[PDB]
Amino acid sequence: MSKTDYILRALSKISHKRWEHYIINRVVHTLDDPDIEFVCQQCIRKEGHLGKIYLADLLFPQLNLYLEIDNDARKADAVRRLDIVEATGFQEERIPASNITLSEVNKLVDEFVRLVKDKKEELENQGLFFRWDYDERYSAKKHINTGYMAVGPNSVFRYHRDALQCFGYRRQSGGWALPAEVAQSIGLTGRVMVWFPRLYEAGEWKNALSADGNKITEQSLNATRNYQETWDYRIVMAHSRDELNRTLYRFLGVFAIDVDKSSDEVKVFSRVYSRVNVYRSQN
Amino acid sequence: MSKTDYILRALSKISHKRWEHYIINRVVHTLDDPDIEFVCQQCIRKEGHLGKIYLADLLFPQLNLYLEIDNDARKADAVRRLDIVEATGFQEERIPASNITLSEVNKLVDEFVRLVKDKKEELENQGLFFRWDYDERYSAKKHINTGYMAVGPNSVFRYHRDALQCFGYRRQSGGWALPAEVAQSIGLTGRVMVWFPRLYEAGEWKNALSADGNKITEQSLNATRNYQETWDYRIVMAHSRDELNRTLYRFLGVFAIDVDKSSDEVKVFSRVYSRVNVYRSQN
């Protein structure tokens, strides 16, 4: 789907909520910068472990900013396809969709579009800002540039071959063991794999994700596939879906078996690191 | 329906056509002037007697400007509710919805929004520009100010009492005879009425409007209501409908019986004047 195709669907998909459509459409158009990513109607986890999902109306991946304008339909469904993103150290600006006039409302938008304008001066003054690159939407490139990978809007991957490239894949269905070299290089101590899990009942696994974002539970339905956990860390790239029901893999963080809580039938993994360095064979 | 309610439905009703929604929404927002009327998806007759209806995407009543971006669904239906407007001496600017990039497309919008910007400098320099007045959307006020009334977006009226006020109604179902005073005052010579016709089969009349806009045909179904035309001019304010199926009365022009072509059963009226002065008992 083309960038414009993307841009044109983004602005036009918000016709349910009339107030939201205005304010979204105003700001994006107002701003008139095609070097700036924006996401619409992205469900979200916010600061503090709450298990509560919020709907962010505008999110700018490349600045840690989202706009909120104050739904159980979407929230329940996105969760259902793990279409969530953890937006921590993400600035929240807000706009009230009640008890206000347009002349004030698009004053706020006028103010907020300055933020977006000004919070990009910093990232350009500090040489951290990298112009929106749509065609590398779901690739490694960003991550190899940065050298690390956090939970966020950025760490999403179309295919397995795309996340494994951040961990030395040169050539990857199911799981991939990092070579002991890279494992140690990126600063994980042990025996380490990337896991591409389903986080629901699927074939022979009834898996699950805590509301927290912080505990994976996995339960084998078939028992000939009960096993002993030999891995010290799992880097988890969970199966999830688009608004258009396409498969993406979301980086959930680096997890590790909780051994007391775990069993042969039912293992429990806790989240240990919410980011991870990425491996380039350098210096 | 509130102005904002209007403004917010206007921008948000265009989600069928993705290219159109962008360009509409860009320009209106881009322009950011609440002292400017705009209409969306207004079907239209254009220069030269063609009987061909076009869809104008943006129309600014208070400047004779509409934007077109290049449908049989709407066209057929609007006609069906006489939701047409004759836009003559109306400037046409155009934008191609095919074989173009966004960076160019919103260049055009950037240019076109200058026109809208600059074609309002004239009407302010020449003291003719009167800031958008939504709550008098369908009233007489405009017309009493101007002193005359043309076919156009402006000459539309919620109730009969609203058009008859332009012709001396002080207090009006069916037809209203202008007093001989006003008839002569506004410069029509004869015996003159305002007609509020249905322009289709309705109860005891199978009426019709030529594709031209220029000939009303009326045929009595009941025959005890065949009559001799005694009126010299009919000022016609035709029954029509909103996008939301509310009744409005559109000024079609000043018409007169074509006597050769007419009959007892079936009278034919031709359009003689496409505007009309309006009566104030002055000087």
Author numbering:
A (entry chain C), B (entry chain C): 1 to 70, 77 to 177, 182 to 293
Paper text:
PvuRts1I is a modification-dependent endonuclease with high selectivity for 5-hydroxymethyl­cytosine over 5-methylcytosine and cytosine. PvuRts1I family enzymes are classified as bacterial type IV modification-dependent restriction endonucleases and they are known to play an important role in defence against phage infection. In contrast, most enzymes of the PvuRts1I family selectively bind to 5-hmC and 5-glucosylated methylcytosine (5-gmC) with high specificity over both 5-mC and cytosine, and cleave substrate DNA at a fixed distance from the modified cytosine. The structure consists of two domains: a novel SRA-like domain that recognizes 5-hmC and an unusual nuclease domain that has not previously been curated by the NCBI Conserved Domain Database.
The PvuRts1I crystals diffracted to 2.9 Å resolution and phases were obtained by the single-wavelength anomalous dispersion (SAD) method. However, part of the putative active site (amino-acid residues 71–76) was not visible in the electron-density map and could not be modelled, and may be highly flexible in the absence of the DNA substrate. A search of the protein-structure database using DALI revealed that the overall structure of the N-terminal domain is similar to the very short patch repair (Vsr) endonuclease, with a root-mean-square deviation (r.m.s.d.) of 2.4 Å. Comparison with structures in the PDB using the DALI server revealed that the C-terminal DNA-binding domain of PvuRts1I is related to 5-mC/5-hmC binding modules, including the SRA domains of Arabidopsis SUVH5 (Z-score = 4.9; r.m.s.d. = 3.1 Å) and human UHRF1 (Z-score = 4.4; r.m.s.d. = 3.1 Å) and the SRA-like domain of another modification-dependent restriction endonuclease MspJI (Z-score = 4.2; r.m.s.d. = 3.2 Å). As for other 5-mC/5-hmC binding modules, the overall shape of the SRA-like domain of PvuRts1I resembles a saddle, with a concave surface at the open side of the β-barrel. Similarly, we speculate that PvuRts1I recognizes 5-hmC using this surface. The interaction interface between the two molecules is formed by helices α1 and α2 of each subunit, and involves hydrophobic interactions and hydrogen bonds. The buried surface area of the interface is approximately 812 Å2, which is clearly adequate to stabilize the dimer in solution. The recognition sequence of PvuRts1I is approximately 22 bp long and 74 Å in length, which fits well with the distance between the two recognition sites in the dimeric PvuRts1I assembly. The binding pocket of PvuRts1I is shallower and wider than that in SUVH5 and UHRF1.
